[PDB]
Symmetry: D2
Subunit: 501 residues, 4 copies
């Protein structure tokens, strides 16, 4: 079977070889990067079913990010397969500061009374935790008594019991045993810190990514359509209008404004890590199912992210709850599933991609029986969408091995993908930007080909390209769609049912 659900894999040091050493080996960071060895490891992730790589600009400077994108370009030629390039913005992060001295962390007991400083550009002590707030904002007046400062993925709770106006320090009570380490994520739920719609650092990072050549941006902590539209303006200004924007939903404001965000964006990334700290963790599954259905109804892309195979950072096999999570994301209707630390930082990046692909491929077989999405309820709002509905009908009526679309912009492929046909979708397109832009759409196999002329038989081309790719053999039935004839048709207007010779 072809894997219909797409995989986003985050890259990092786990796949990178430095002077013969693997990540974690003593002296690793002493060696220089082995680009070709690193590219060969990335190529195995491609072959195992990674469809797009995520460059997390939360970690690593422009030089590191640029070298990693260059490494991926080599890997595509080794694998003989192209992938999408996705930039993930830092966004409005709050992190613990470095500590006074060599100290990298301190342990605390429940009940201990300590201080959180708001003043920026200072080091932490054990009794006074300093915060690196994005844009060096002053958060003192945005956090009330009774709020919670959560350190390192919500593991250590600090309850704000008092506010000292004279030092702009929070007087906090430690709510549970735990460690405060340097440069760890901080969340302060149910506060409104006036972060800008687009920080200068995120503007800078996006402009650098656009210069290197990306297909997607995932915007961290989208609160409103304005956060999306500010990035859209840079993409249009720089001649990168083809770049697709995924809004990351990871706080209550993003959930409250979801309809206007979906309208502004090309898709949604369900950023469950921050979402499950910022809102009640037991509500994340409710929001996941609702976001998937709304994004599919819009004909846009949804990525389900974070902790999907978390145990595989350290172990070669996932837990039963991780297998269940990946399976259920697919059944809920996700276009794509994602790996973060599992592929970037863990001991088992290749096994993480392989395991996710195996689960994804099994789950796609149960979408007829258990699938939550319901294409029968959609309004068919254009003639290309009417043709997409008819293709889904044909794949419901008989056994169709493949749907082929000859698509200039990918619009027909995206509408067929929206209807989730019981078939793979081969999208024959005529430029690499359209090809890479389809790589996160459910079921879509993008394939670059010459633009057909007025005199070409597009149905013979479709069958020949499908046979070349090894997607079909003698006796298989396929559905082909195209705008016939070239130079007269203004849209996909034709559906052919064809038996492969």
């Amino acid at each position: 079977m072809n894997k219909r659900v797409k995989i986003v894999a985050t890259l990092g040091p786990a796949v990178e070889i430095r002077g013969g050493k693997k990540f974690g080996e003593d002296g690793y960071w002493g060696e220089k990067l082995d680009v070709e060895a690193s590219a060969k490891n990335i190529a195995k992730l491609i072959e195992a079913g990674a469809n797009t790589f995520r460059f997390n600009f939360s970690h690593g400077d422009h030089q590191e990010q640029g070298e990693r994108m260059a490494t991926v370009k080599l890997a595509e030629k080794i694998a003989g397969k192209k992938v999408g390039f996705l930039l993930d913005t830092k966004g409005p992060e709050i992190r613990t500061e470095l500590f006074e001295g060599e100290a990298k962390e301190y342990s605390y007991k429940t009940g201990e009374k300590i201080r959180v400083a708001t003043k920026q550009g200072i080091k932490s002590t054990r009794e006074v935790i300093a915060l690196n707030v994005a844009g060096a904002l002053d958060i003192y007046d945005d956090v009330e008594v009774g709020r919670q400062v959560l350190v390192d993925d919500g593991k250590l709770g600090l309850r704000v019991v008092a506010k000292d106006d004279a030092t702009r320090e929070f007087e906090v009570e430690v709510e549970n045993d735990g460690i405060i380490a340097k440069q760890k994520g901080v969340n302060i739920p149910n506060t409104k810190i006036p972060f800008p719609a687009l920080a200068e650092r995120d503007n800078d990072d996006i402009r650098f990514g656009l210069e290197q050549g990306i297909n997607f941006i995932a915007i961290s902590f989208v609160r409103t359509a304005k956060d999306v539209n500010e990035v859209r303006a840079i993409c249009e200004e720089t001649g990168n209008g083809h770049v697709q924007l995924f809004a990351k939903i990871e706080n209550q404001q993003g959930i409250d404004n979801l309809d206007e965000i979906i309208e502004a964006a090309d898709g949604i990334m369900i950023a469950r890590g921050d979402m499950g700290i910022e809102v009640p963790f037991e509500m994340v599954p409710v929001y996941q199912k609702m976001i998937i259905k709304k994004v599919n109804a819009a004909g846009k892309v949804v990525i389900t992210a974070t902790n999907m195979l978390e145990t595989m950072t350290e172990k070669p096999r996932a837990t039963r709850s991780e297998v269940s999570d990946v399976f259920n994301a697919v059944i809920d209707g996700t276009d794509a599933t994602m790996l973060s630390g599992e592929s970037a930082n863990g001991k088992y990046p290749l096994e993480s991609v392989t395991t996710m692909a195996t689960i994804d491929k099994n789950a796609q077989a149960l979408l007829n029986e258990y699938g939550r999405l319901d294409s029968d309820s959609f309004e068919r709002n254009s003639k290309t969408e009417v043709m997409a509905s008819a293709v889904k009908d044909a794949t419901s009526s008989m056994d169709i091995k493949l749907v082929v679309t000859l698509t200039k912009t990918g619009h027909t492929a995206r509408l067929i993908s929206k209807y989730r046909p019981n078939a793979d979708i081969l999208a024959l397109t005529f430029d690499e930007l359209t090809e890479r832009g389809l790589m996160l759409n459910w079921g879509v196999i993008p394939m670059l080909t010459d633009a057909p002329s007025s005199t070409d038989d597009m149905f013979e081309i479709a069958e020949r390209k499908a046979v070349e790719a090894g997607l079909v053999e003698s006796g298989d039935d396929i559905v082909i769609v195209a705008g016939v004839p070239v130079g007269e048709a203004v849209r996909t207007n034709t559906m052919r049912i064809r038996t492969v010779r």
Copy 2:
């Protein structure tokens, strides 16, 4: 607004002019037929939406039937529109004889004592009604004292009160006021008369009709699949394998054997008049709904017949129950509705066809809301059927004015019809026998055209034929299906959505 539900109109004296006189005028029967004046009246019925004319061989002789068929052929040339020719057999039936002195009928009052003769080959008198029993059977020993003899659709009941062994006559009491006319149907409920497999008169009548040129045979009182297969053998032997056979279901044996009868036949006529006497009258609506559903599921034609606008035989307006019946037959899923005495024997044959057409056109607009048929439940058993399902999906997804099929045998048109699309179906075919054979399929407008060559654009031909027929105009959306290309396609394999230029 085109009428999708087809009308079968029975012809008889009501539309016939004889020496300038109309049916009912003094001296009418002393005149000979005025062929042109009659053909002009028949052309009005064709223009009002009669799709097929029924020639009932229970009435008249071969000469009357042959002349009436020739009058309809002139009527088609006057109207500029072809119709289907349907022959209705006598079958294993009992009919009243001709009367001595060519009286046509007598009137009777409740309580009169008269006789019914069993001797074959004699004429009736007012006091002694003679029976024409198929196969010239003697039924004297088959009918006990206390049986009811019903004349003419059960309009007049005779109770057997004694049997006269000297004359083999039933002594009967007239149960209700009414008429006994020549060649009227006689039922004797709850008797078992051993009618032959195929009466010699039926063999003669079928061969005469096939020689004249017919498109359909409705077989009266079909008991088993063998009754259909006996007629099929005659059609195949004489080179008339294109003739379609409608089995009339009008007794318990036909109901019991319905599945095998549907399998052998091209369609079913729900002959409610006899059915409602031979089985309990309150079961006829149950059987009607169930037959319509099974025949549609088999991709065949169903005709609903008898008493549909019965009151319009004598009055210019139908009753509320007649309008309800026609409307409900359409909602139940009928391909065709039929007029018997209304068109053959009544004062308002034109108004009856017009009235039926008006109701049928209103009811087809409620099929989406109320329609009993459910095409979502069908198994798509072939690639042509897969395309028919996709066409229905396209007409459900957007406003489609017309479906056009280029069909050599009518197969694609019959499968599109089976799915009851929200559109009229223009069937372009290449021979007059295929054209007339589609005239009773729901929604199908048959039209004769030249077979396309391999240099022709079939989509341009489809649009041009539709415009020229006045079915569509600039800006209408149509679906076109065809087997592309001519000389290579096995079957219909292409669907195009086209805006009329």
Copy 3:
């Protein structure tokens, strides 16, 4: 089986014996009414399944109507069964006047030019038709050129070609051959004649009926809720608040105002006779299905009326379209079906009731498979309605022979009836007005019993009353509902599943 669909039979001379003579016999009107013989004929209609008699105040003076109601009171004691008494108002009728001389009618040809007079209290001539307009209203200024004056059930069309202001006469063209007889119904569609909300004659007739003792009023030509509320005021003023009002829907205004009429009334009579003249005849089946569903959703009673077995006025067997009409009314969800001329004026009143009962009883067996009503969609708006829903669930889960309700006002019986359970409903009530008021509710068998005390076992009473009535036998399962205990319960609160001993 018990018949669940109720029958309304119109009474008239057909069942009345006068000095040994049957209606239609020479000298019939010369004889005096034989009350007891007439009561014995009415008792047979009761035994055959008439549940309510209709007294049509369109025909016959107070003396005739009062004597007929008295005759029905004798018939109930002969049959051993009570019936409902329904008064049908004359309403805003327009009728042709008597003719100059002995003349009872004239024939006309299409094209003939004649006059319709608006002046009241004058006789007709052949060339000048005079109208008896209800309340002697002047209709001249309410009828435009191009309107149609329709005589005798829409059979003769008169087109208004000109208006003569000097005689206030309509200049009309005869549109079809036909007869204008004295005292025939006239309709003038798409005109607004300012008839009062309640005419003095209708006020008078209702007050007379209320004095005699009626259970129901059917209000002719209801246009608005005001027409209902004016009759409600008389019922409340006279101490007859228990009388239920059925609005007759028979024109476009009534259809347009249906929701407010349903809210004001206790039920709707679908008066298809006038409705199919006043609105396009082909729309009556659309309005019938929609009215039935809306009235059932309101928990109120719907009667389907007019022409249901029309042929049985003259023939002992109905047409196939009449059988179909009755069957389909039941499947559409009607509470009751009605007879007018078939039972009032025809040759076969008893056979008409019997035939309607047979069809109704067969159709009730198909409501699980084909029934249009959908109780799963209702909001359960009270605790008694929650219990009604649970009773329907129990009758869906297992074979329940009977539902018994101990009901003071009939409210619980009406809510159970609304849900159309697969069981008969025995309604045990404690006064005759409540008993007779339930006689047109689907499935309800009203039965008068002593009000239970605090110490009675109501479940034993229910089983004993069901066994006495012959509705159940040993081993049958029943559902019983009641407000337990008496004097504490404020509503039906208890459901028992019980096996009969």
Copy 4:
């Protein structure tokens, strides 16, 4: 908000205090159990929503298990709340032996070469791991070179690289970093070891548990119905016929024989840990959904087990995939969710139960929108089930706070539970064995009460018990079912809708 989904919590050292020391503290294992301090920790889990405790007889000896059962009996008296006692058998399993010198465990690195002994009845060393094979079987000839030996839920893999015939040891390579501890589960995928029908140790363990007093037995690695029936025979022989048997499904033979296993058992535990090693890991979510649906359809209990909040063994917050898994188990239809190492072996046993309860309570609120189970599809196979269907209907029709059943054996409560009403279910029963036996049914709150006499009002008792339990207050609506009257009713036969006074 009551928790409807039941929690099974496994007990082990995590909640046990030994000489004032907590699990993990230095010297813990050199101290003896502090029974009162331990019982106080267990009482906190009961108060947090543990409904049943699991005693895993794969760990420890009879004395440890017996003392732990006695500590839980004290914990119930501290909490003032009863729980279920569940014994989990060893079954046809392989476990690691005890180590020489009572080391508990050793840590290993990838690439280490060690041995696995097959000789039975010996202890492990760090370099030579010994196996406890059920039935003391010799597995040396059953395991080929190239097989994988997996330790502890597949956390640590050993590859067989050679076999040493002199010692009957496997020579293995450590595949990944991890721990080998005593009494850990060992899997050897794709081998066929002839485990006996019922191991002597399982016979001993079941008899010991039955002597101590248990309510449930979970049978490990159920292969066929005979594995359940062998245990049933022991329960029936010792007078413990009230003990309920949960078959653990954790291999292909159990899946293949699921229908006959469900028929013999009282429920199913979906033992995902072993299932995901013994069958392909990506099939476990398919089997989980299908088991839940079949067990509910049989009116039995299903427990979803293993890795549900696995990360809370070491961290105070679950991963996003763990929360998704718990949430989806509830939506799939599980009666119960289970904690293994989280409660038995982890740093946060209380927080793990609290976390599970929070997710289970949120997910039960989405069963109307997302729930997989469909009670509309069940055949109601008895009159008690008919009443359970009616109760569900009442909770769907209006807001019902609580369903109260007076149940002698729990049968009515089990059938109401099967239908998953939108309400909590208070089951008033009359003996402690019936009370504890209902503790794993979805939504059921069991409560012990005096058997009502024939003079008692059961509806008043139901309301009083509900108020006294704090489940309802004045103005809440409840449904009450019972068999009325006591001493005559066969079964539950009455439903009352009651407003709490």
